[PDB]
Amino acid sequence: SDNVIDIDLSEDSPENYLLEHAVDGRMLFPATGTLVLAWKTLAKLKGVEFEQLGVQMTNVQIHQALFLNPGGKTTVSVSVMPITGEFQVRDGESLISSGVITSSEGRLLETDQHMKKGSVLDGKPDKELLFTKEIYREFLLRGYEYGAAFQGIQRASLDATDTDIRWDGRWISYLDTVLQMYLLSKPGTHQALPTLLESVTIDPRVHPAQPPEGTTEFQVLPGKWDPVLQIAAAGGVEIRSCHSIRASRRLNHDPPILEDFA
Amino acid sequence: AGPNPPKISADSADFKELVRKDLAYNVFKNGKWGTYRGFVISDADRQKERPSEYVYADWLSAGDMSSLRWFDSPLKTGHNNGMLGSKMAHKLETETCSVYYAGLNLRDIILANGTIQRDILPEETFFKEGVLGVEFSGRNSSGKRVMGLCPPPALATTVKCPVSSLWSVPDQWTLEEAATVPLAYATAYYCLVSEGGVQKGATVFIHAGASVVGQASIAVALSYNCEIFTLTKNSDETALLKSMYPQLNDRNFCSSEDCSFEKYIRKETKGSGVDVVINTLRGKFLKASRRLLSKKGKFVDIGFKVDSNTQIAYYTREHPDLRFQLDALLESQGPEWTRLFDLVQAGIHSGVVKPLKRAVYSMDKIVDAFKTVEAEREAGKIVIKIRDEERQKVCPTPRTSFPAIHRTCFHPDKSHILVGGMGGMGLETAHWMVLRGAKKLILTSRYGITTGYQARKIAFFKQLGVEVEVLALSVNTRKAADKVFEHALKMGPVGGIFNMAMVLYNDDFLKMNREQFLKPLESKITMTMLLDDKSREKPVRDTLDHFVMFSSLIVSGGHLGQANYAFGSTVLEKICERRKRDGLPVTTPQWASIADVGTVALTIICRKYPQRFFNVLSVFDFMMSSDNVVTISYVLVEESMVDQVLRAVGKVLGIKDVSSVDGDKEFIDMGVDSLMSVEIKQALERDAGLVISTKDTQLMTFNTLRSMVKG
Amino acid sequence: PQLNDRNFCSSEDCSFEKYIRKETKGSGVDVVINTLRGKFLKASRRLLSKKGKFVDIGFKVDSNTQIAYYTREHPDLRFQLD
Ligand SMILES: NC(=O)C1=CN([C@@H]2O[C@H](COP(=O)(O)OP(=O)(O)OC[C@H]3O[C@@H](n4cnc5c(N)ncnc54)[C@H](OP(=O)(O)O)[C@@H]3O)[C@@H](O)[C@H]2O)C=CC1
Ligand SMILES: *P(=O)(O)OCC(C)(C)[C@@H](O)C(=O)NCCC(=O)NCCSC(C)=O
């Protein structure tokens, strides 16, 4: 009924990076993807620019998975109720997301992480730091195939607490890199697909503006995972109490052949 | 070589014959000329069932109730898997029992058919081998006949039941009857006497009166002299309940087909309502049941298929989640549990607790038993008969074997050496061993912990309760080998030696000096002989249980520039066959390109695709439980609109040839969890105009799909 | 006199949840006598222990909460002494 979004997954579309996010060969729409769609829809309803709007989503259920069609086009029909804030992303007669989105003009951020300037991960040895190669070896072994646009975390501690998330302008990818601090906070071997983010605040007025066009040395925003409150915060974003559902692992190749050298 | 060994020397006789044949590979073994060849192991053998003393029921594919099989139980090692993390905080005293009958509840069916993931269960069961079965009835270690509840898996042949959860079977019930009592009546007392606080003369409303928990709830309430209202599906259930409990008239029965009971219960109680509501139905029946509550009434909701809003309530502490409380109590076994233990124990003596109806299913009919519970076409308990009860009342359990599928397990009291295990496949293999039982690892390297990824996982293991010792020692001298095993016997008996070391130097054979040649020959020859020698001498020889030597396909496929690595890798493959001649344990995986971990991790070499590590460990589990020495494992790389969508839909299910499989076999029969169905559902719209329901997906054949796209 | 400065928090902002959870070593509070509304009510419920009890005696309940009382979803304890 309200704003209909067309995700163009073509060769040179600006949203071609959305294909660099797959789970064992399944190219799914990011769980934080629906957060941006709902966030942008509220701004369009209000008439303000989505980057000047401070939102707060509550109880964001990812009801069902959206399989992006490579080299094609997918349509969603985001719908936000004017005063209550009930938002809903849907495709035809199938529900894909739900929750409540609210805007405000005051402080929406609980943790005081939007004030941190540099990075605690300075001067530490190489054996007390994780780098981009090693962080995404942990994710890959669990089935999360991240590409180059979703590989935001540049550094971290062995505790997974402190990070060096990268800010490069794209919002669907940045909100995912903040949700990766949650995934690497629960070491394991199974594959979990997030299905409920209880609270998300994206106050952009305390968040660095979009990089000047043509930039290549994108800056890094310090982030932190709060094991007490279960809050993943980095810059002007927080995700609190995100739950996931285990999923069986799919073999992308064909079954191996076992022989007996005799 | 036989009594007449060949005499191949220049102008010899046996040699001249070889030259005439002119064969590129001549090996004299077992007294005959031949060739080393890789013979394909059929795919049917990976699931071949062999006799095993201790077995337990699990699922091959999660969410499929037709994939339940019997696997080997680590209880052959005495202990049980999942002794990591929280499970190490409760030092419960346990009694090892031999299970004779295993009870089947709706909790097991819910987990088996994918309605709930194992992560909803108590955190102490996160690393358990399986999550199926809680109640049982068998014989303890002393021969006494016992029954009780234990953390899963109780659907096995041996359990380690806490001594505070074990009742004694009265000398009137057969072991078959005792298998129905524990959980049904333990939950009835929890719902009524522990959570509902029932009082004498109170009015209680019980949903699904014919269910096993429903029947138990009625018996407890009647003992409390309550006014009972129950929901019965059909007249057969109503008649059955009346026969079991003569105190029930036709006035105490309603219908679960519609929410018309509300007026009946609200008129017969004169508007006071019902004091306790044991709720299993959902939707509008849940709302109507709440509205019947008295002013002090309690609502106990034990349904499993909760909605989304009420699932949020559980997360945000709005409501208490009581559908997995018996499981949680059994982990802690604290004051709350002992109250239920006393209540049920009292009930047995006072005659309230009486065996329910039963339906015995053999072990091999586990799949049929699970389907019977799920359908709920008839009332009664479903119990799997594991053994046959002896005529005596106190006698030892005869030692017998059951057919089961392989499952590698490692002794928790034995130390395992992982030479070169701090890298690539070693760290993700040590993780596998920890999950499967290993709790004592000695990882060895030339330098030590030198990267942040290593330090993170070594810290992860130590957190889980594993004792990891990292030695920076290369075993290239008998002195070093003694030191490594000295640090091993000080942790525990040495029960495994894995060599996953590699030092590659790649160059054309002609351009390699002596030093450069023997670089990959230290971790594959010099080591493997020093580790082999130690395993051949006591005390390791008696204790040693696994001896694994990882190798590569260069032994059977060859490669260019890696003449040295080929030489060493083959000698490792022959040192692991001398061990077989002498009867010692030995295993030598012969891998191909592998993904996600190591050398390849940093694609297609010799046309062979890299394997996913979660498969490397699936076949590796097969490799350890096998009789052969070397098992080669590698992966090789691979119209009308009606056939277009069929291929895509078949590809989702994991079928390579859609035409090969039967056209009359439903999708659920092959296996369609919860994500394959949505992918098909969105694909039948993306590819064609069809729009189908998710539930319709699992009950539709390939022929139906073909006949539907044409329409 | 028994109470010390450690036993007090501030009602102005929802920073007590962090402090209480840290001071209780993650076990949570066994009983909550709740009068505040909105984000303070949710935060108080999240401090509840596994057995913890939530007693809500506030009078100015929200419309959704009031419907819960009518539906028998929750008990209404604000006029129970009466
Ligand atoms: N990776 C693959 O795709 C394939 C693997 N394999 C086999 O599987 C294993 C792969 O392990 P991978 O981690 O991938 O190889 P890597 O090169 O990734 O790391 C191997 C480890 O070997 C250790 N190592 C080497 N020499 C010694 C030594 N003398 N003493 C102690 N430790 C030593 C190194 O530790 P440090 O660096 O600290 O000395 C290194 O961490 C090897 O055994 C290999 O033969 C078989 C076929 C292909
Ligand atoms: P059935 O038990 O009904 O299955 C429910 C499923 C299909 C799992 C549904 O809840 C679902 O698909 N949820 C996942 C939503 C999702 O993909 N979120 C994360 C985006 S992908 C990522 C982490 O890579």
Q: What is the DSSP annotation of chain A?
A: ----EEEEESSS-GGGGGGSEEETTB-BPPTTHHHHHHHHHHHHHHTS-GGG-EEEEEEEE--S--B--TTEEEEE--EE-TTT-EEEEEETTEEEEEEEEEEESS----STTTT--S-S-SS--GGGEEEHHHHHHHHHHTTEEE-SSS----EEETTS-EE--B--S-HHHHHHHHHHHHHTTS--SSEEEEEEEEEEE--GGGSPPPPPTT--S--B--EEEETTTTEEEETTEEEEEEEEEEEPPP-SSPPPEEEEE-
For a mutational test of ligand 2's pocket, the pick from B678, B679, B695, B698, i.e. the residue with the most ligand atoms closer than 8 A to its C-beta, is: B678
- Report CB contact under 8 Å: C45, B290: no
Ligand 2 centroid to Cα of residue B610, in Å, is 27
- CA of A243 to nearest chain B CA: how many angstroms apart? 9
Amino acid at A138: E
CA atoms within 13 A on the CB side of B365: 13
Ligand nearest to the CA of B475: 1
Which chain B residue's Cα is nearest to C44? B317
Please give the number of the atom of ligand 2 that sits closest to the Cα of A245.
8
Q: How many CB pairs under 8 A join B and C?
A: 17
3 state DSSP class of B172:
coil
**Best residue in C12, C14, C15, C18 to probe A by mutation, most A CBs within 10 Å?**
C18
Q: Return the structure tokens found at C82.
A: 């009466």
What is the distance, to the nearest Å, from the Cα of residue B349 to the centroid of all Cα atoms in its chain?
38
Q: Which residue has the tokens 């499993």?
A: B304
Ligand nearest to the CA of A31: 2
**Closest by CA position to B152, among listed B163, B164, B161:** B161
For residues B458 and B470, give the distance between their C-alpha atoms in angstroms, rounded to a whole number: 9
- Report CB contact under 8 Å: B317, C71: no
Q: Which residue has the tokens 């490579």?
A: A70
Q: Does A168 touch chain C (CB under 8 A)?
A: no
Q: Does A229 touch chain C (CB under 8 A)?
A: yes
Q: Does B317 touch chain C (CB under 8 A)?
A: yes
Phi/psi at A261 (5° precision): -65, 105
Q: Return the structure tokens found at B698.
A: 């699992």
Ligand 1 centroid to Cα of residue A42, in Å, is 54
- Report CB contact under 8 Å: A258, B428: no
- Report CB contact under 8 Å: A228, C21: yes
A86 forms beta bridges with A100
Q: b or e along A99-122 (b: 16 or more beta carbons within 10 Å of the residue's beta carbon)?
A: bbbebeeeebbbbebbebeeeebe
- Pick the residue whose CA is nearest to atom 1 on ligand 2: B674
Amino acid at B181: V
Q: Which chain B residues are Cβ-neighbours of C52 within 8 angstroms?
A: 317
Residue B186: in which H helix or E strand, if any? helix B181-189
Give start and end residues of each alpha helix (H) in B296-395: 309-315, 325-332, 335-350, 366-375
The CA angle B268-B271-B275, to the nearest 5 degrees, is: 85
Phi/psi at C14 (5° precision): -85, 50
- CA of B269 to nearest chain C CA: how many angstroms apart? 18
Which chain C residue's Cα is nearest to A229? C18
For residues B356 and B370, give the distance between their C-alpha atoms in angstroms, rounded to a whole number: 18
Q: Return the structure tokens found at B621.
A: 């589990």
For residues B236 and B376, give the distance between their C-alpha atoms in angstroms, rounded to a whole number: 13
Ligand 2 within 6 A of CB of A243: no
All partners of chain A with 3 or more CB pairs under 8 angstroms? B, C
For residues C6 and B381, give the distance between their C-alpha atoms in angstroms, rounded to a whole number: 56
For residues B227 and B237, give the distance between their C-alpha atoms in angstroms, rounded to a whole number: 19
Q: Are B169 and B150 in contact (CB under 8 A)?
A: no
Backbone Cα Rg of chain B: 31
Ligand nearest to the CA of B470: 1
For a mutational test of ligand 2's pocket, the pick from A20, A26, A28, i.e. the residue with the most ligand atoms closer than 8 A to its C-beta, is: A28
Helices (H) and strands (E) in chain B, counts: 25, 28
Sign (positive/negative) of CA torsion B411, A184, A156, B423?
positive
Please give the number of the atom of ligand 2 that sits closest to the Cα of A63.
10
For residues B14 and C64, give the distance between their C-alpha atoms in angstroms, rounded to a whole number: 96
Instruction: Report resolution in angstroms.
Output: 3.1
Q: Return the structure tokens found at A92.
A: 């035809």
Ligand 2 centroid to Cα of residue A96, in Å, is 10
Q: Are B214 and B286 in contact (CB under 8 A)?
A: no
The CA angle B594-B595-B597, to the nearest 5 degrees, is: 100
Contacts of B590 (CB under 8 A, 6+ apart): A261, B551, B552, B553, B555, B556, B573, B630, B631, B632, B633
Beta-sheet strands, E only, within chain C: 29-34, 48-56
What is the distance, to the nearest Å, from the Cα of residue B81 to the centroid of all Cα atoms in its chain?
10
Q: Does C42 touch chain B (CB under 8 A)?
A: yes
- CA of A85 to nearest chain C CA: how many angstroms apart? 15
Residue B482: in which H helix or E strand, if any? helix B478-489
Q: Return the structure tokens found at B282.
A: 């959902």
Q: Does C22 touch chain A (CB under 8 A)?
A: yes
For residues A182 and B451, give the distance between their C-alpha atoms in angstroms, rounded to a whole number: 22
Exposed/middle/buried for residue B618 (C-beta within 10 Å: 0-12, 13-18, 19+):
middle
For residues C45 and C40, give the distance between their C-alpha atoms in angstroms, rounded to a whole number: 9
Q: Are A75 and A86 in contact (CB under 8 A)?
A: no
Contacts of B176 (CB under 8 A, 6+ apart): B101, B137, B358, B360, B383, B385, B389
Question: What is B199-257 written as a DSSP string?
Answer: -TT-EEEESSTTSHHHHHHHHHHHHTT-EEEEEESSHHHHHHHHHH-TT--GGGEEESS
Beta-sheet strands, E only, within B374-425: 382-385, 402-404, 415-419
Q: Are A249 and A24 in contact (CB under 8 A)?
A: yes
Q: Are C56 and C80 in contact (CB under 8 A)?
A: no
Ligand nearest to the CA of A34: 2
Q: Does C60 touch chain A (CB under 8 A)?
A: no
Cis peptide before B539 (omega within 30 of 0): yes
Q: How far is CA B533 from CA B381, B519, B528, B529, in A?
A: 57, 22, 8, 6
For residues B99 and B676, give the distance between their C-alpha atoms in angstroms, rounded to a whole number: 37
Q: Are B515 and B438 in contact (CB under 8 A)?
A: no
A131 forms beta bridges with A155
Q: Does A110 touch chain C (CB under 8 A)?
A: yes
Phi/psi at B93 (5° precision): -85, 120
3 state DSSP class of B569:
helix
Sign (positive/negative) of CA torsion A74, A140, B84, B455?
negative
A102 forms beta bridges with A56
Amino acid at B231: L
For residues A39 and B683, give the distance between their C-alpha atoms in angstroms, rounded to a whole number: 28
Q: Return the structure tokens found at C37.
A: 């509304």
Q: Are B369 and B582 in contact (CB under 8 A)?
A: no
3 state DSSP class of B489:
helix
- Report CB contact under 8 Å: A259, B450: no
What is the distance, to the nearest Å, from the Cα of residue A222 to the centroid of all Cα atoms in its chain?
16
Which chain B residue's Cα is nearest to A96? B678
Q: Which chain A residues are Cβ-neighbours of C26 within 8 angstroms?
A: 228
Q: Does A228 touch chain C (CB under 8 A)?
A: yes
Please give the number of the atom of ligand 2 that sits closest to the Cα of B694.
3
For residues A133 and B428, give the distance between their C-alpha atoms in angstroms, rounded to a whole number: 16
Question: Residue B259: how many CB atoms within 10 A of its CB?
Answer: 18
Ligand 2 centroid to Cα of residue A192, in Å, is 8
Contacts of B586 (CB under 8 A, 6+ apart): B547, B549, B576, B577, B579, B580, B629
What is the distance, to the nearest Å, from the Cα of residue A203 to the centroid of all Cα atoms in its chain?
15
For residues A232 and B230, give the distance between their C-alpha atoms in angstroms, rounded to a whole number: 48
Backbone Cα Rg of chain C: 14
> Three-state SS string across B13-46, please?
HHHHHHHHHCCCCCEEECCEEECCCEEEECHHHH
Helices (H) and strands (E) in chain C, counts: 3, 2
- CA of B302 to nearest chain A CA: how many angstroms apart? 21
**CB within 8 Å of chain B, chain A residues 125-164:** 126-131, 134, 137-138, 140-141, 143, 158
What is the distance, to the nearest Å, from the Cα of residue B119 to the centroid of all Cα atoms in its chain?
13
Q: Which residue has the tokens 């059994």?
A: B330
B167 forms beta bridges with B147
3 state DSSP class of C4:
coil
Ligand nearest to the CA of B562: 1
Q: Which residue has the tokens 């519970």?
A: B373
Q: Does A198 touch chain C (CB under 8 A)?
A: no
Residue B163: in which H helix or E strand, if any? none
Question: Residue B671: how many CB atoms within 10 A of its CB?
Answer: 18
Residues with CB under 6 A from ligand 1: B 419-420, 422-426, 444-447, 450, 474, 500-503, 522-523, 550, 552, 591, 593-594, 597-600
Q: Are A236 and A55 in contact (CB under 8 A)?
A: no
3 state DSSP class of B74:
helix
Method for structure elucidation: cryo-EM
- CA of B406 to nearest chain A CA: how many angstroms apart? 16
For residues B154 and B383, give the distance between their C-alpha atoms in angstroms, rounded to a whole number: 12
Q: Which residue has the tokens 């279960």?
A: A230
Q: Which chain B residues are Cβ-neighbours of C71 within 8 angstroms?
A: 287, 290-291
Q: What is the dihedral of CA A77, A80, A86, A89, to 10 degrees?
A: 20
Calculate helix-pair angle for B325-332, B181-189, nearest 10 degrees: 100
Q: Are A36 and A171 in contact (CB under 8 A)?
A: yes
Question: Residue B94: how many CB atoms within 10 A of its CB?
Answer: 18
Q: How far is CA A222 from CA A89, A167, A178, A235, in A?
A: 31, 10, 11, 7
**Best residue in A97, A142, A198, A261 to probe B by mutation, most B CBs within 10 Å?**
A261
